[PDB]
Amino acid sequence: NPWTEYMAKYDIEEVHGSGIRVDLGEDAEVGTQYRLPSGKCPVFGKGIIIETTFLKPVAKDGGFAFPPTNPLISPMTLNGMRDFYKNNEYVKNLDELTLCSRHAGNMNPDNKNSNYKYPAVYDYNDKKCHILYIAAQENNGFCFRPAKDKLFENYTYLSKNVVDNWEEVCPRKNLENAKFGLWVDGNCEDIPHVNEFSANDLFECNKLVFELSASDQPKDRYKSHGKGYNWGNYNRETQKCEIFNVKPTCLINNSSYIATTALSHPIEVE
């Protein structure tokens, strides 16, 4: 299988290792244990819909983000962060997503050393890192839910564990003229069983895959560890989002198709 190295980033269980729709793959104490995001990959286009937009600072007149601080460490621009850490050579040159993740992970709420590290959102639109004070992602029993949405397409959801080489080992772009397959005896075969959801465009397919992807809460017991319906083959001609839950191990050339994952950006292709 010559696809092995290339397909590694699509082994979402291995490279991400946590929930995607809802990421709560670890626990940390602050006396009391709390659930918190721990996925190793950035989630492109993921945001939180409040049923106040969620990047507003916490106060129900407030959102999910860090309250104002002195100095203001959230929200903080990329340049603001690089300046803040200008003396730290291990941090100052990190890519924007990892830096945002490390910046959020810098703020210890236990003022003893604790393992609790806030998740974050980097907004590519105005180059701002938003530390999330609230790590919750769904409450549909304040009612809210995670989603991919046009309003969120420049948002990126970042756990404390985002790896510094995510660009190399994590999905971002959708693959044009390509279909996920399974390598069997020297040939790339079709995913034998897929779940067909109609979708008007690639965005809607990406949205659907996200909705069905690995999730660490319903709607240790609940942890997905990255297992789930994380991949989709979008047939742009029949407008079918072909969703499946086993890792792909090769690509098939097919101009009718675009290959997407729950982690991938909902628009960008390569």
């Binding site: 601080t69 703020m107 003022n111």
Partner: peptide, 13 residues
């Protein structure tokens, strides 16, 4: 109030 984990340690409120 939070405390930075990376040196230099500081208190940000």
């Amino acid at each position: 109030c939070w405390t930075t984990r990376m040196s230099p340690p500081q208190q940000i409120c």
